[PDB]
Amino acid sequence: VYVPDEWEVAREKITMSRELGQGSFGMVYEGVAKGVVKDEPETRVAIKTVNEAASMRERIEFLNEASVMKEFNCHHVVRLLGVVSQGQPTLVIMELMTRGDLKSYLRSLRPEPPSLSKMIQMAGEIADGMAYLNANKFVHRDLAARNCMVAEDFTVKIGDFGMTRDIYETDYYRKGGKGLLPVRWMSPESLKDGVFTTYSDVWSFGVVLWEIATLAEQPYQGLSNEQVLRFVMEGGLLDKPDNCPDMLFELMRMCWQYNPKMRPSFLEIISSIKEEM
Ligand SMILES: C[C@H]1C(=O)N(c2ccc(SC(F)(F)F)cc2)C(=O)N1Cc1ccnc2[nH]ccc12
Ligand code: NI
């Protein structure tokens, strides 16, 4: 969009309530949208916005990125509901994930022993999505607990809040003063040669596993960003989390195989888990 399609919807249908946080292209809100889900009058939505400052060509960056999600149909990726293109506010509508990001959820559980089952359950839902994504030649590049989203019924879905929430600023290194990088989630090949594949994603899934087991500790805590680079690229791995089940630690190690070709497909992982069930 360029070229509005059947996805285009009316600004009037979309009422915005409170804020969620800062997206790459502008703020993001809670809200409600009528006639966007069939057999359903009203729908709780995340309204993503561009900026009353940033003009046409970075307003197109935004829409054409969301044009990619039109292809998608996984109950385990966050759903595009519509677009609002013609008009100065310029916003995208998305199924509202009501329990927020998975890092926040896991941290909300700290201050009071999560079942192998519960964790295997989540890890399976996460791989469902990533399996679909990588199926459709889509490589996420920032798979992390902070980009997994939780539903009213505790279902996990792959999303992407972007690299720019105040709340997770310690999760990004500005390497070279070039882009923000999730250096703690990145494969040695992503770190050295800037290589991003479906297996760069399987590396980050292993880190997410680690996050699930730790109720979202900072990976490689006690290492500065430059030291993580050095550590991982030089063959270095994360330690087995305290009270981590073996099932789970051994997935993480398959995901952290140095040589990307030795790591498994999300399909391999879904297979691997779905026996333990
Ligand atoms: C910022 C908005 C958004 O644009 N995305 C998103 C971006 C790309 C894809 S496609 C991919 F998963 F990457 F493959 C999916 C979702 C989100 O997750 N968002 C956050 C979000 C969505 C819903 N409910 C929420 N609650 C609290 C936050 C929140
Ligand atoms: Ni499911």
mmCIF file of C-alpha atoms and ligand atoms in Angstrom:
data_model
loop_
_atom_site.group_PDB
_atom_site.id
_atom_site.type_symbol
_atom_site.label_atom_id
_atom_site.label_comp_id
_atom_site.label_asym_id
_atom_site.label_seq_id
_atom_site.Cartn_x
_atom_site.Cartn_y
_atom_site.Cartn_z
ATOM 1 C CA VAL A 1 0.000 0.000 0.000
ATOM 2 C CA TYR A 2 0.883 1.857 -2.506
ATOM 3 C CA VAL A 3 -2.312 0.382 -4.086
ATOM 4 C CA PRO A 4 -4.869 0.003 -1.258
ATOM 5 C CA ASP A 5 -6.481 -3.518 -1.355
ATOM 6 C CA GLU A 6 -9.552 -5.247 0.200
ATOM 7 C CA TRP A 7 -7.494 -4.942 3.555
ATOM 8 C CA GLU A 8 -7.986 -1.094 3.698
ATOM 9 C CA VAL A 9 -10.452 -0.015 6.472
ATOM 10 C CA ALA A 10 -12.149 3.219 7.612
ATOM 11 C CA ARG A 11 -10.456 5.442 10.282
ATOM 12 C CA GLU A 12 -13.909 5.802 11.972
ATOM 13 C CA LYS A 13 -14.197 2.017 12.831
ATOM 14 C CA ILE A 14 -10.900 2.311 14.807
ATOM 15 C CA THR A 15 -11.167 3.902 18.327
ATOM 16 C CA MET A 16 -7.790 4.092 20.252
ATOM 17 C CA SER A 17 -7.686 3.648 24.100
ATOM 18 C CA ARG A 18 -4.261 3.476 25.947
ATOM 19 C CA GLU A 19 -0.582 3.075 24.813
ATOM 20 C CA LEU A 20 1.405 -0.189 24.579
ATOM 21 C CA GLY A 21 4.780 1.410 23.668
ATOM 22 C CA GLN A 22 7.142 2.812 20.987
ATOM 23 C CA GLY A 23 7.153 1.073 17.511
ATOM 24 C CA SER A 24 9.959 1.687 14.890
ATOM 25 C CA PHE A 25 7.705 4.032 12.821
ATOM 26 C CA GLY A 26 5.744 5.639 15.721
ATOM 27 C CA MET A 27 3.716 4.940 18.898
ATOM 28 C CA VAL A 28 1.454 1.804 19.326
ATOM 29 C CA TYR A 29 -1.986 1.754 21.076
ATOM 30 C CA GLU A 30 -4.796 -0.415 22.371
ATOM 31 C CA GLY A 31 -8.166 0.166 20.632
ATOM 32 C CA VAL A 32 -11.253 -1.501 19.077
ATOM 33 C CA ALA A 33 -12.193 -2.151 15.411
ATOM 34 C CA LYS A 34 -15.682 -3.089 14.086
ATOM 35 C CA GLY A 35 -16.189 -5.571 11.182
ATOM 36 C CA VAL A 36 -12.573 -6.879 11.025
ATOM 37 C CA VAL A 37 -13.189 -10.385 12.478
ATOM 38 C CA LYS A 38 -16.269 -12.151 10.848
ATOM 39 C CA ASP A 39 -19.213 -13.250 13.150
ATOM 40 C CA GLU A 40 -18.045 -10.656 15.775
ATOM 41 C CA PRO A 41 -19.202 -7.023 16.259
ATOM 42 C CA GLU A 42 -16.168 -5.463 18.070
ATOM 43 C CA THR A 43 -12.479 -6.633 18.265
ATOM 44 C CA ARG A 44 -9.667 -5.679 20.720
ATOM 45 C CA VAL A 45 -6.771 -4.520 18.477
ATOM 46 C CA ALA A 46 -3.199 -3.190 18.576
ATOM 47 C CA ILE A 47 -3.103 -0.006 16.438
ATOM 48 C CA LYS A 48 0.449 0.593 15.189
ATOM 49 C CA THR A 49 1.081 4.183 13.890
ATOM 50 C CA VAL A 50 3.552 6.199 11.771
ATOM 51 C CA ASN A 51 4.643 9.786 12.744
ATOM 52 C CA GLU A 52 3.081 13.227 11.891
ATOM 53 C CA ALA A 53 6.789 14.154 11.145
ATOM 54 C CA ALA A 54 8.154 11.350 8.868
ATOM 55 C CA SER A 55 6.818 11.795 5.269
ATOM 56 C CA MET A 56 5.738 9.529 2.295
ATOM 57 C CA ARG A 57 8.809 7.194 1.695
ATOM 58 C CA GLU A 58 9.195 6.065 5.393
ATOM 59 C CA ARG A 59 5.306 5.923 5.564
ATOM 60 C CA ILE A 60 5.732 3.336 2.672
ATOM 61 C CA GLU A 61 8.643 1.462 4.488
ATOM 62 C CA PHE A 62 5.889 0.885 7.159
ATOM 63 C CA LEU A 63 2.880 -0.244 5.020
ATOM 64 C CA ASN A 64 4.881 -2.554 2.637
ATOM 65 C CA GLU A 65 6.449 -4.369 5.684
ATOM 66 C CA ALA A 66 2.830 -4.994 6.915
ATOM 67 C CA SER A 67 1.878 -6.072 3.301
ATOM 68 C CA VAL A 68 4.099 -9.145 4.017
ATOM 69 C CA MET A 69 1.738 -10.287 6.837
ATOM 70 C CA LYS A 70 -1.208 -10.391 4.338
ATOM 71 C CA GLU A 71 0.198 -13.750 3.043
ATOM 72 C CA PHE A 72 0.164 -15.301 6.589
ATOM 73 C CA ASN A 73 -2.360 -17.676 8.252
ATOM 74 C CA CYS A 74 -0.797 -19.288 11.436
ATOM 75 C CA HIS A 75 -2.852 -19.284 14.657
ATOM 76 C CA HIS A 76 0.689 -18.934 16.203
ATOM 77 C CA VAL A 77 1.814 -15.712 14.390
ATOM 78 C CA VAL A 78 0.079 -12.425 15.375
ATOM 79 C CA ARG A 79 -2.753 -11.675 12.825
ATOM 80 C CA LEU A 80 -3.001 -8.592 10.561
ATOM 81 C CA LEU A 81 -6.630 -7.349 10.711
ATOM 82 C CA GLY A 82 -6.485 -4.302 8.380
ATOM 83 C CA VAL A 83 -4.806 -1.112 7.093
ATOM 84 C CA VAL A 84 -5.623 2.669 7.083
ATOM 85 C CA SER A 85 -3.519 4.223 4.260
ATOM 86 C CA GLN A 86 -5.349 7.337 2.849
ATOM 87 C CA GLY A 87 -5.109 9.975 5.675
ATOM 88 C CA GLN A 88 -2.520 11.768 7.872
ATOM 89 C CA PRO A 89 -2.546 9.480 11.010
ATOM 90 C CA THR A 90 -1.565 6.252 8.944
ATOM 91 C CA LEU A 91 -2.090 3.119 11.147
ATOM 92 C CA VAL A 92 -2.096 -0.761 10.910
ATOM 93 C CA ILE A 93 -4.516 -3.046 12.941
ATOM 94 C CA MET A 94 -3.497 -6.339 14.526
ATOM 95 C CA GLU A 95 -5.102 -8.946 16.821
ATOM 96 C CA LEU A 96 -4.631 -7.612 20.438
ATOM 97 C CA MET A 97 -2.399 -10.001 22.477
ATOM 98 C CA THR A 98 -3.936 -9.206 25.887
ATOM 99 C CA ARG A 99 -1.228 -10.592 28.295
ATOM 100 C CA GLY A 100 1.590 -8.664 26.568
ATOM 101 C CA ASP A 101 5.129 -9.818 25.601
ATOM 102 C CA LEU A 102 6.538 -13.184 26.827
ATOM 103 C CA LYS A 103 9.599 -11.588 28.609
ATOM 104 C CA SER A 104 7.205 -9.487 30.816
ATOM 105 C CA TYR A 105 5.023 -12.548 31.561
ATOM 106 C CA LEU A 106 8.047 -14.681 32.628
ATOM 107 C CA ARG A 107 9.274 -11.774 34.860
ATOM 108 C CA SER A 108 5.792 -11.345 36.418
ATOM 109 C CA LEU A 109 6.208 -15.036 37.591
ATOM 110 C CA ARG A 110 9.566 -14.417 39.483
ATOM 111 C CA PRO A 111 8.618 -12.712 42.800
ATOM 112 C CA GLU A 112 6.590 -15.625 44.454
ATOM 113 C CA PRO A 113 8.678 -24.229 39.731
ATOM 114 C CA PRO A 114 7.332 -24.053 36.135
ATOM 115 C CA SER A 115 6.384 -27.615 34.937
ATOM 116 C CA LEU A 116 8.449 -29.270 32.137
ATOM 117 C CA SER A 117 4.931 -29.600 30.560
ATOM 118 C CA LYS A 118 4.064 -25.824 30.807
ATOM 119 C CA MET A 119 7.453 -24.858 29.325
ATOM 120 C CA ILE A 120 7.345 -27.586 26.612
ATOM 121 C CA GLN A 121 3.770 -26.340 25.822
ATOM 122 C CA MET A 122 4.980 -22.712 25.277
ATOM 123 C CA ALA A 123 8.174 -23.828 23.339
ATOM 124 C CA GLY A 124 5.900 -25.869 20.998
ATOM 125 C CA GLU A 125 3.549 -22.882 20.326
ATOM 126 C CA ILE A 126 6.616 -20.705 19.593
ATOM 127 C CA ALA A 127 8.042 -23.239 17.084
ATOM 128 C CA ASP A 128 4.585 -23.617 15.372
ATOM 129 C CA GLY A 129 4.802 -19.969 14.337
ATOM 130 C CA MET A 130 8.486 -19.947 13.439
ATOM 131 C CA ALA A 131 7.958 -23.148 11.395
ATOM 132 C CA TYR A 132 5.211 -21.304 9.400
ATOM 133 C CA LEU A 133 7.347 -18.160 9.049
ATOM 134 C CA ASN A 134 10.471 -20.023 7.782
ATOM 135 C CA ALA A 135 8.096 -22.072 5.495
ATOM 136 C CA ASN A 136 7.077 -18.772 3.794
ATOM 137 C CA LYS A 137 10.742 -17.668 3.315
ATOM 138 C CA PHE A 138 10.291 -15.289 6.326
ATOM 139 C CA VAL A 139 13.395 -14.947 8.614
ATOM 140 C CA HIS A 140 12.511 -13.050 11.795
ATOM 141 C CA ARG A 141 16.031 -11.733 12.776
ATOM 142 C CA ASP A 142 14.959 -10.756 16.400
ATOM 143 C CA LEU A 143 13.316 -13.891 17.792
ATOM 144 C CA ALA A 144 13.317 -13.296 21.608
ATOM 145 C CA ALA A 145 10.893 -13.734 24.514
ATOM 146 C CA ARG A 146 10.210 -9.971 24.193
ATOM 147 C CA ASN A 147 8.735 -10.521 20.683
ATOM 148 C CA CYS A 148 6.648 -13.562 21.594
ATOM 149 C CA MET A 149 3.182 -12.377 22.602
ATOM 150 C CA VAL A 150 0.655 -13.981 25.001
ATOM 151 C CA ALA A 151 -3.139 -14.247 24.369
ATOM 152 C CA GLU A 152 -6.173 -14.052 26.743
ATOM 153 C CA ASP A 153 -6.001 -17.939 26.959
ATOM 154 C CA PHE A 154 -2.102 -18.041 27.578
ATOM 155 C CA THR A 155 -1.388 -19.129 23.939
ATOM 156 C CA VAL A 156 2.037 -17.847 22.750
ATOM 157 C CA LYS A 157 2.353 -16.229 19.260
ATOM 158 C CA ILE A 158 5.376 -14.871 17.295
ATOM 159 C CA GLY A 159 5.163 -11.102 16.840
ATOM 160 C CA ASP A 160 7.718 -8.265 16.642
ATOM 161 C CA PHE A 161 7.375 -5.150 18.863
ATOM 162 C CA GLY A 162 10.598 -3.765 17.255
ATOM 163 C CA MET A 163 14.008 -2.757 18.618
ATOM 164 C CA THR A 164 12.793 0.430 20.341
ATOM 165 C CA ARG A 165 10.886 -0.071 23.681
ATOM 166 C CA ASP A 166 12.471 1.924 26.564
ATOM 167 C CA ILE A 167 11.767 -1.267 28.599
ATOM 168 C CA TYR A 168 14.239 -3.608 26.777
ATOM 169 C CA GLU A 169 16.965 -1.031 25.778
ATOM 170 C CA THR A 170 19.650 -3.283 27.542
ATOM 171 C CA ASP A 171 18.712 -5.985 24.966
ATOM 172 C CA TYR A 172 20.269 -4.004 22.028
ATOM 173 C CA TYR A 173 23.902 -3.053 21.272
ATOM 174 C CA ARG A 174 24.654 -0.299 18.773
ATOM 175 C CA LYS A 175 27.613 -2.210 17.182
ATOM 176 C CA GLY A 176 29.646 0.247 15.042
ATOM 177 C CA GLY A 177 27.036 2.930 15.685
ATOM 178 C CA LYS A 178 25.302 0.994 12.832
ATOM 179 C CA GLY A 179 21.937 -0.623 13.742
ATOM 180 C CA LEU A 180 20.718 -1.739 17.175
ATOM 181 C CA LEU A 181 21.620 -5.491 17.495
ATOM 182 C CA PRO A 182 20.159 -8.140 19.870
ATOM 183 C CA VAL A 183 23.771 -9.383 20.319
ATOM 184 C CA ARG A 184 22.732 -11.774 23.183
ATOM 185 C CA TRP A 185 20.207 -13.505 20.880
ATOM 186 C CA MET A 186 22.446 -13.753 17.801
ATOM 187 C CA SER A 187 24.215 -16.749 16.170
ATOM 188 C CA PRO A 188 28.010 -16.623 15.743
ATOM 189 C CA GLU A 189 27.415 -16.303 11.940
ATOM 190 C CA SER A 190 24.937 -13.341 12.471
ATOM 191 C CA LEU A 191 27.639 -11.797 14.776
ATOM 192 C CA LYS A 192 30.676 -12.269 12.418
ATOM 193 C CA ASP A 193 29.365 -12.137 8.836
ATOM 194 C CA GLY A 194 25.824 -10.618 9.350
ATOM 195 C CA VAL A 195 24.229 -13.879 8.146
ATOM 196 C CA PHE A 196 20.482 -14.284 8.991
ATOM 197 C CA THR A 197 18.849 -17.614 7.917
ATOM 198 C CA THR A 198 16.041 -19.782 9.353
ATOM 199 C CA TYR A 199 18.939 -21.325 11.466
ATOM 200 C CA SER A 200 20.030 -17.963 12.787
ATOM 201 C CA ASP A 201 16.336 -18.103 14.041
ATOM 202 C CA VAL A 202 16.793 -21.659 15.526
ATOM 203 C CA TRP A 203 19.810 -20.187 17.459
ATOM 204 C CA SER A 204 17.570 -17.463 18.921
ATOM 205 C CA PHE A 205 14.912 -20.103 19.679
ATOM 206 C CA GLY A 206 17.474 -21.895 21.873
ATOM 207 C CA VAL A 207 18.081 -18.576 23.668
ATOM 208 C CA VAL A 208 14.275 -18.232 24.107
ATOM 209 C CA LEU A 209 14.193 -21.756 25.628
ATOM 210 C CA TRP A 210 16.944 -20.498 28.013
ATOM 211 C CA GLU A 211 14.785 -17.387 28.804
ATOM 212 C CA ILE A 212 11.671 -19.634 29.515
ATOM 213 C CA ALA A 213 13.806 -21.754 31.957
ATOM 214 C CA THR A 214 15.258 -18.646 33.728
ATOM 215 C CA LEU A 215 11.986 -16.605 33.900
ATOM 216 C CA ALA A 216 13.830 -14.207 31.515
ATOM 217 C CA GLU A 217 17.298 -13.518 33.002
ATOM 218 C CA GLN A 218 19.689 -11.478 30.701
ATOM 219 C CA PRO A 219 21.589 -14.108 28.639
ATOM 220 C CA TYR A 220 25.385 -14.019 29.247
ATOM 221 C CA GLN A 221 24.857 -11.699 32.297
ATOM 222 C CA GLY A 222 28.256 -10.429 33.591
ATOM 223 C CA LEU A 223 29.509 -10.129 29.993
ATOM 224 C CA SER A 224 29.419 -6.636 28.400
ATOM 225 C CA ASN A 225 28.057 -6.494 24.809
ATOM 226 C CA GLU A 226 31.602 -6.584 23.259
ATOM 227 C CA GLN A 227 32.502 -9.664 25.458
ATOM 228 C CA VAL A 228 29.368 -11.594 24.285
ATOM 229 C CA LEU A 229 30.412 -11.025 20.630
ATOM 230 C CA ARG A 230 33.907 -12.339 21.463
ATOM 231 C CA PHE A 231 32.533 -15.190 23.684
ATOM 232 C CA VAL A 232 29.873 -16.591 21.268
ATOM 233 C CA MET A 233 31.842 -16.093 18.013
ATOM 234 C CA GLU A 234 34.782 -17.920 19.759
ATOM 235 C CA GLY A 235 32.591 -21.057 20.388
ATOM 236 C CA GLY A 236 31.166 -19.961 23.788
ATOM 237 C CA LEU A 237 27.750 -21.257 25.013
ATOM 238 C CA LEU A 238 25.194 -20.356 27.766
ATOM 239 C CA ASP A 239 25.245 -22.377 31.049
ATOM 240 C CA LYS A 240 22.410 -24.908 31.767
ATOM 241 C CA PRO A 241 19.813 -22.945 33.795
ATOM 242 C CA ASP A 242 19.443 -23.875 37.539
ATOM 243 C CA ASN A 243 16.643 -26.596 37.806
ATOM 244 C CA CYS A 244 16.463 -26.901 33.953
ATOM 245 C CA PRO A 245 15.007 -30.267 32.745
ATOM 246 C CA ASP A 246 17.236 -32.324 30.356
ATOM 247 C CA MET A 247 14.692 -32.400 27.459
ATOM 248 C CA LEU A 248 14.927 -28.592 27.439
ATOM 249 C CA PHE A 249 18.705 -28.181 27.893
ATOM 250 C CA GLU A 250 19.291 -30.688 25.028
ATOM 251 C CA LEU A 251 17.049 -28.729 22.559
ATOM 252 C CA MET A 252 19.050 -25.592 23.436
ATOM 253 C CA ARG A 253 22.289 -27.433 22.515
ATOM 254 C CA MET A 254 20.890 -28.638 19.143
ATOM 255 C CA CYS A 255 19.846 -24.971 18.489
ATOM 256 C CA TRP A 256 23.410 -23.752 19.503
ATOM 257 C CA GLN A 257 25.387 -26.133 17.243
ATOM 258 C CA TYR A 258 28.164 -23.755 16.033
ATOM 259 C CA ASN A 259 27.823 -24.913 12.415
ATOM 260 C CA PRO A 260 24.302 -23.780 11.284
ATOM 261 C CA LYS A 261 23.833 -26.923 9.047
ATOM 262 C CA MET A 262 24.202 -29.123 12.233
ATOM 263 C CA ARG A 263 21.262 -27.247 13.969
ATOM 264 C CA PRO A 264 17.662 -28.458 13.459
ATOM 265 C CA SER A 265 14.689 -27.082 11.479
ATOM 266 C CA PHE A 266 11.772 -25.855 13.629
ATOM 267 C CA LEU A 267 9.959 -28.847 11.980
ATOM 268 C CA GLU A 268 12.702 -31.128 13.537
ATOM 269 C CA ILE A 269 12.043 -29.339 16.887
ATOM 270 C CA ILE A 270 8.211 -29.554 16.694
ATOM 271 C CA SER A 271 8.739 -33.281 15.877
ATOM 272 C CA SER A 272 11.278 -33.683 18.769
ATOM 273 C CA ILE A 273 8.814 -32.145 21.335
ATOM 274 C CA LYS A 274 5.481 -33.524 20.046
ATOM 275 C CA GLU A 275 6.543 -37.082 21.073
ATOM 276 C CA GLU A 276 6.789 -35.805 24.743
ATOM 277 C CA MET A 277 2.939 -35.180 24.618
HETATM 278 C C1 LIG B 1 3.920 -3.547 17.431
HETATM 279 C C2 LIG B 1 2.909 -4.618 17.042
HETATM 280 C C3 LIG B 1 3.275 -5.255 15.715
HETATM 281 O O1 LIG B 1 3.250 -4.627 14.645
HETATM 282 N N1 LIG B 1 3.633 -6.550 15.910
HETATM 283 C C4 LIG B 1 3.961 -7.437 14.926
HETATM 284 C C5 LIG B 1 4.893 -7.144 13.919
HETATM 285 C C6 LIG B 1 5.180 -8.071 12.917
HETATM 286 C C7 LIG B 1 4.511 -9.293 12.886
HETATM 287 S S1 LIG B 1 4.866 -10.479 11.660
HETATM 288 C C8 LIG B 1 6.116 -11.555 12.506
HETATM 289 F F1 LIG B 1 5.655 -12.066 13.657
HETATM 290 F F2 LIG B 1 7.187 -10.815 12.802
HETATM 291 F F3 LIG B 1 6.432 -12.566 11.702
HETATM 292 C C9 LIG B 1 3.575 -9.602 13.857
HETATM 293 C C10 LIG B 1 3.310 -8.671 14.862
HETATM 294 C C11 LIG B 1 3.539 -6.821 17.227
HETATM 295 O O2 LIG B 1 3.789 -7.910 17.744
HETATM 296 N N2 LIG B 1 3.107 -5.752 17.912
HETATM 297 C C12 LIG B 1 2.936 -5.636 19.368
HETATM 298 C C13 LIG B 1 1.628 -6.209 19.916
HETATM 299 C C14 LIG B 1 0.769 -6.851 19.059
HETATM 300 C C15 LIG B 1 -0.419 -7.380 19.543
HETATM 301 N N3 LIG B 1 -0.751 -7.296 20.817
HETATM 302 C C16 LIG B 1 0.058 -6.688 21.681
HETATM 303 N N4 LIG B 1 -0.035 -6.469 22.989
HETATM 304 C C17 LIG B 1 1.056 -5.799 23.382
HETATM 305 C C18 LIG B 1 1.840 -5.593 22.321
HETATM 306 C C19 LIG B 1 1.252 -6.128 21.250
HETATM 307 NI NI NI B 2 -1.914 -24.372 18.644
#
